[model samples]
Target: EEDIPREPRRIVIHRGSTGLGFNIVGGEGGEGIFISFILAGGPADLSGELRKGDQILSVNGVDLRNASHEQAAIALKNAGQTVTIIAQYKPEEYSRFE
Candidate 1:
């Protein structure tokens, strides 16, 4: 009954590069992409199973380490119901935005 609403949740993925600004300028860093959520709250949020700091490691057994931002976004959108998400949770540091 009550659990029906929480059993399944929608997951959204995104992509972007990662590294310090200097690394980008020095050409030490390469293209990178990641998945994140724009909307927080609802089933996924209430379940406490996923967090904002978590990273998507794979999709349907495919590794996402080198996946392009566009590719990852497409994968996330096409992922059927009952999809599995391999994620790693990390400590997040942030500054207040006024």
Candidate 2:
């Protein structure tokens, strides 16, 4: 896999309350809310704006650098209707920079 440059993406399907169909994982020592899974044929995949391994930089406009996994989920869940995500892709063997 390759790491993509940080990019801003607005992905909203209005299909369900969850918004995009992606599994995110991020906590204190995690890689910041990431795109762990992208359900096939889901709005996330169909939007082509998100991919596995993408690290979320923010939800809506709030920086998630200090957000935990649960916080990210809540952020996304309460984003109203449209969800804008700014993210940076990370490889499997990527390391965090200080």
Candidate 3:
């Protein structure tokens, strides 16, 4: 597994949208969404908006926090040729010495 680092920005912004060629998996704890892997030179890689450990915030201007893996994928597809997603990068987790 791998994770990409990113800075948080304003809620969701508009960008050139399209069908993304990537795989996603639910958060380890079954909490949020994540980008499992990316297809080389595909739509998602071309967009450069997806990355590992990136929590899916929304899909196609629709909410995605509570969405299932299938729902997110379906939503993206149902959104037509363009899939707009709002996601955030999750940095490494913290650990404390006991």
* Top-TM-score structure, candidate number: 2
**Model 2 C-alpha lDDT per residue in residues 31-93, reported as the tens digit of each score:** 567777888877787877677777777877877867898888888788766677777777452
**Model 2 RMSD to the real structure?**
3.8
- TM-score pick, better of 2 and 3: 2
- Which candidate, 1 or 2, has the higher TM-score? 2
Compared to the true structure, candidate 2 yields what TM-score? 0.75
lDDT of each: 0.40, 0.69, 0.61
Query: Judged by lDDT against the true structure, how good is candidate 3?
Result: 0.61
Error of 2 at 58 (Å): 0.7
Which should have the higher lDDT, number 1 or number 3?
Answer: 3
Top candidate on lDDT is 2
| TM-score for predicted model 1 compared with the true structure | 0.51
* 1 or 3, greater by TM-score: 3
Q: In model 2, how large is the Cα lDDT of residue 92?
A: 59
Q: Give the alpha carbon lDDT tens digit for every residue of 40-79 in model 3.
A: 7777677666665566778767787788878877876676
Candidates 2 and 3 compared: the better one by lDDT is: 2
